[PDB]
Design a protein around this ligand. Structure first.
Ligand SMILES: [Zn+2]
Lengths: 46, 121, 117, 206, 59, 48, 122
RNA sequence: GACGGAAGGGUUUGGCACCUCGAUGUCGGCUCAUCGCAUCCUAGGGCUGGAGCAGGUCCUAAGGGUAUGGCUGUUCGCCAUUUAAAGCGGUACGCGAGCUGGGUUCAGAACGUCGUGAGACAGUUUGGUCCCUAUCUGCCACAAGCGUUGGAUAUUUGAGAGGAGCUAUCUUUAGUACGAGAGGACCGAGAUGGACGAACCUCUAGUGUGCCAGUUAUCCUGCCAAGGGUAAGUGCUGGGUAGCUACGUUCGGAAAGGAUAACCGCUGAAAGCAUCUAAGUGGGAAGCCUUCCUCAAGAUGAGAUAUCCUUUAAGGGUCCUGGAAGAAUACCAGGUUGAUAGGUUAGAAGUGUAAGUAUAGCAAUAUAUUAAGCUGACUAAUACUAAUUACCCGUAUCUUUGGCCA
RNA sequence: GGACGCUGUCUCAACGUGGAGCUCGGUGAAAUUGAAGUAUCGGUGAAGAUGCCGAUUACUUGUGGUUAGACGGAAAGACCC
RNA sequence: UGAAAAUUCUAAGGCGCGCGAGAGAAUCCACGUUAAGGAACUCUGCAAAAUACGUACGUAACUUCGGGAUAAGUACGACCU
């Protein structure tokens, strides 16, 4: 077991999934605590 | 796609190509000037200039190498004695191949190969 | 000149050790296990050198518990700690692949050079 | 989109600090200048015209010469491309290689290697027939259509013909190293084109 | 693998005229004799070429 | 309609015109504009 | 590069001495197994009067291959014969001891107990 | 869902004998596919006698995928292991001017049965020529010519078209929800793979009839020494750079948005209620349209711009030296103002210590001179040679109208 | 029918070699052929259309490749009557 | 050379096949080599690969007593003294 990689941003912030709602749309997106940049898939925050 | 750059293969298998090159170089050194197909002459000069630059310096070991390619003793001695001492200084390009036109009959591209400076007599 | 070779010279940082094909050598190198490193060792006969430039590698063969093992090491790799030459041998090839066919005691030995007094 | 005209020098490998090897392609960047601008209200769209390595003054036609009349000390450029929807620059400017300093992934566009008239088995990974058991069928197409319906060969059936020479853009190449003093970029992986061919490097879309 | 119908004279003429077409060689008058010789070839009439003798033209 | 505002009317007129070289020429004789303005002011077209 | 029909040395003390690969697991058209993969083997030759009979089908893990496979640090390790170890249902070594060396990709494939019972890890 | 009743599909066994016997080659396998949806998997649902897990039934959905072997000529089927699944069909039961000929359907011979016999048998066994240089359409690629309303040179908007669209295991959420227990999640994240596709040669690996070394037989260079030829299309072995290649390396399947299928609605009638619909207005899938990559103004609807030229100018072509390109072409680099090619010099590297001389040994041979000699398909330098004091193509026609200016 | 050894038979193809193929010069056939400013789809029809209907698509002309069709060529079908 | 009129090379002697020259694309036919696996190919180990000589050692079931048998299996081979 290669140590379970901690789900961390490239800016040292935890990445957490939120579900925005907008106009009949549930949206899932990824949010970084340290820098508050909103992206949609944590791929884009590593 | 083509690999093996550096030849023309002269349209013949390896042994016969080597024999062809040896014979034509021998004749070229003997006669100071020959006429043939452009491709054949091109390869001939690629090897003749190499032989001349190897024979610029006359030693036993160098002579014994040049014998591995020049099997005519008379022409080997001529190459080591009469030809190179006039190209001792020239940095390269000892020969000169000049086109002659399409030959009648099978329309080959003829050309003339000669030495830039004629050797000692 | 070449920009490739200049980049290589800028990235060497780890000079090649001195040894020749046919010597018996011990290489000591680093190995990671997750987060921890250990020093590992490999005794055997160098039986080839390799490619041009920084990609140069060498091959080491040894016999372990009756089973042959070969390893390929990149020469300029930072993981290589030390290479030490236990016995220096005299060969005539440039690649000693015939040792793969040698069997028994003959499968692992190379006559050494004996420096003149 | 930030882009540059580079030249594929070749490939090599580098050793990361802990020992991990990374195979890289090296790109050399001759100076790139902004030659002109395209505007939505005059050309219909917004883009920046970018140019690279110079031409020999004996082989510049006068249309090309006049293209550079108003620019000061910018000789004619052999490789000219367009960068759509870019700002922050104007005619006479000059783009460093460091515009990628903050970028993690790039995209590279170049002209893939040419392979000449190539057969189906190389071109499309066709299997062939057996090489024994009486076979007289080795690297031919096989069947191509159906019998009477449709009584023709469908458009786009894959056969023999020329292979490669097209443009291609490879995506999400990781950026390994940037070296300003030698004007070089080191990306991780393969880049289309032969040695010395000229590629265009753009900031990655993703 | 055999012609299905005899082609029209138009098609035969077109193919023949396109294929059986030989191109003129380039020329350049000799600096010595003024003959029109093939460009980049020794003059076949006087033997000179860029003011150098290479042949000895006979009958 | 959204991708090509003139396409429906062009298609319909092309269908209703005769076929052949003269039909194609007649369709060449037609200009369709999405908006309420045209560029052929030099011809003083007669309104209908 | 173990494929179907490949012969392998059983490198443990269950009793078998030669095994034959009859399937490469985990993939539809999967054709090759590497170090640390699990294959389905049939036993072609065994020590007499052992707990493993000739002609039984088990699962095994590959511990040595004769074709080198790249590692992260650029090193390649190429053994001299292909060898495997029999596993029980829990995907754990059925035997109690392992003969000869093994390659260290077992470490990453999480076969720590095979690694420990091995003699040398290369 | 019995007993019955009404249809469609044209695939099974048949019916008919309409096309073809001055010939439409018949079963499987191989290769290559394309299409239908009556969906095997992945996706979205309704209901369950659906606790959960796992299912059952029905509806929507064809984007992608849909295994390797044993037996048999077999399709089929059974069986062994796998897998998210091992779909059903049309296309002359797809595909023999693409392949195989095991089977069927010739002449040999044998067995059983029938016949007095010649012989016969949708009974069996064994052996047994698979022809054709592509005229046309079609398709995969590449050019010549001209057009695009003056003629050229670069950079591009894009109609339109093609490519691609697969999926698993494990770890967190959580042994929590659920549940007597056993057992065990939806939703949403992370890591590592399989298959497939593309690019590439840094590594791994193959080739490497350039090259180097060892050695056998025989002939030759007068001989010793040292070499050379021949053992097809390398004499045989040990290596091998460039180039090509996969078994190698790297990358790719997205994210988001729009309009929807089945389905679920909200507000509400006709029909005082009720009702997703009739006025409206919303959610909603690997599908559709954008987005990603490639081709693309012959898109004759021939586009847009910047610059050059104004009676043969701008520019292009031929010729030549070549390549990163290539069947001939084209494209691209270069032509004395010139590093395009050869040669030369040097280097990255291959082979592995030459010849000669000296020493040691009776000799085979070894050591020193020596990281030697030789070879350098690539890289950079250096005009010595070859690319010529050169030859052909190639520019505002006229009519109508509007704007500006005189 | 099975086993050992051995192998590109195969997973899975790659590179090289010799003769053709390609280009040019010389010599120069063949079967075949009502001709031809001979596209595709859905139909129709002696029941599988280059030639008919409706629609769609397509600048003119060659070369190197490939055989889906022209119920292709070859032999007044050998099977059946 | 060798047991040999085998095999390879070569003397005497006779010939260089009565279209050539460029270029090396696909492809066709015939060959060379190969990582890992070793019949998973296929109607069938078809085709290839492999075995191969000399001198010694050692050879079974079965048998008509002759055989099987070169069974199988294995060692040595160069140069100098
Ligand atoms: Zn003249």
């Amino acid at each position: 077991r290669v140590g379970s990689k901690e789900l961390i941003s490239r800016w040292g912030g935890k990445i957490i999934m939120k579900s925005k709602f907008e106009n009949g749309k549930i949206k899932h997106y990824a949010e970084c605590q340290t820098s508050k940049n909103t992206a949609r898939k944590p791929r884009d925050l590593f | 796609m083509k690999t093996k750059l550096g030849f023309n293969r002269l349209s013949r298998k390896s042994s016969h190509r080597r024999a062809l090159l040896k014979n034509m170089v021998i004749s070229f050194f003997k006669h100071e000037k020959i006429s043939s197909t452009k491709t054949k002459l091109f390869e001939v000069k690629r090897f003749a200039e190499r032989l001349i630059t190897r024979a610029k310096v006359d030693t036993v070991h160098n002579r014994r190498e040049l014998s591995k390619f020049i099997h005519d003793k008379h022409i080997l001695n001529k190459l080591f004695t009469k030809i190179s001492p006039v190209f001792r200084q020239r940095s390269g390009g000892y020969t000169r191949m000049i086109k002659l036109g399409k030959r009648y009959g099978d329309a080959a591209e003829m050309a003339i190969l000669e030495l830039v400076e004629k050797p000692l007599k | 000149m070449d920009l490739i070779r200049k980049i290589e010279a800028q990235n060497k940082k780890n000079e090649a050790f001195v040894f020749n094909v046919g010597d018996t050598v011990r290489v000591v190198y680093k190995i990671i296990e997750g987060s921890n490193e250990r020093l590992q060792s490999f005794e055997g006969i160098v039986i080839s050198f390799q490619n041009k430039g920084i990609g140069k590698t060498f091959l080491i063969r040894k016999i372990s518990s009756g089973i042959g093992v070969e390893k390929i090491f990149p020469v300029y790799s930072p993981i290589i700690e030390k290479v030490e030459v236990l016995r220096r041998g005299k060969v005539r090839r440039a690649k000693l692949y015939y040792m793969r066919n040698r069997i028994g005691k003959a499968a692992m030995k190379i006559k050494e050079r004996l420096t003149i007094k | 989109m930030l882009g540059l005209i580079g030249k594929k020098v070749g490939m090599t490998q580098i050793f990361q600090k802990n020992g991990i090897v990374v195979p890289v392609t090296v790109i050399e960047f001759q100076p790139n200048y902004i030659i002109g601008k395209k505007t939505v209200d005059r050309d219909g769209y917004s883009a920046l015209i970018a140019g690279s390595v110079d031409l020999k003054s004996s082989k510049v036609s006068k249309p090309i010469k006049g293209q550079y009349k108003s620019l000061k000390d910018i000789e004619p450029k052999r490789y000219v491309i367009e960068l759509k929807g870019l700002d922050g620059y104007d005619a006479g400017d000059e783009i460093k290689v460091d515009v990628f300093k903050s970028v993690k992934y790039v995209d590279v566009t170049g002209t893939t290697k040419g392979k000449g008239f190539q057969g189906a088995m190389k071109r499309h990974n066709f299997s062939g027939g057996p090489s024994s058991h009486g076979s007289k069928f080795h690297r031919h197409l096989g069947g191509t259509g159906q019998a009477t319906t449709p009584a023709r060969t469908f458009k786009g059936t894959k056969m023999a013909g020329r292979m490669a020479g097209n443009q291609q853009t490879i995506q999400n190449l990781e950026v390994v190293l940037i070296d300003e003093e030698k004007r070089a970029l080191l990306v991780k992986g393969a880049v289309p084109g032969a040695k010395g061919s000229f590629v265009v490097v753009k900031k990655s879309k993703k | 693998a055999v012609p299905k119908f005899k082609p029209s004279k138009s098609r035969s003429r077109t193919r023949r005229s396109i294929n059986m077409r030989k191109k003129i060689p380039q020329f350049q008058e000799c600096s010595n004799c003024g003959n029109l010789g093939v460009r980049h070839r020794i003059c076949l009439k006087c033997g000179y070429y860029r003011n150098n003798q290479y042949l000895e033209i006979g009958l | 309609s959204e991708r090509k505002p003139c396409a429906p009317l062009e298609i319909a007129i092309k269908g209703m015109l005769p076929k052949g070289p003269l039909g194609r020429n007649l369709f060449r004789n037609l200009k369709v504009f999405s908006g309420s303005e045209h560029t052929l002011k030099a011809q003083n077209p007669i309104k209908l | 590069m173990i494929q179907m029909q490949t012969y392998l040395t059983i490198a443990d003390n269950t009793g078998g001495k030669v095994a034959q690969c009859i399937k490469v697991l985990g993939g539809s058209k999967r054709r090759y197994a590497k170090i640390g993969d699990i294959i389905t083997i049939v036993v072609k030759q065994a020590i007499p009067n052992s707990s493993v009979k000739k002609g039984d089908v088990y699962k095994a893990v590959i511990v040595r291959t004769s074709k080198e496979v790249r590692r992260k640090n650029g090193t390649y390790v190429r053994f001299d014969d292909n060898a495997c170890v029999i596993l029980d249902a829990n995907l754990s070594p059925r035997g109690k001891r392992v003969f000869g060396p093994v390659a260290r990709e077992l470490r990453d494939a999480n076969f720590m107990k095979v690694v420990s019972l091995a003699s040398e890890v290369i």
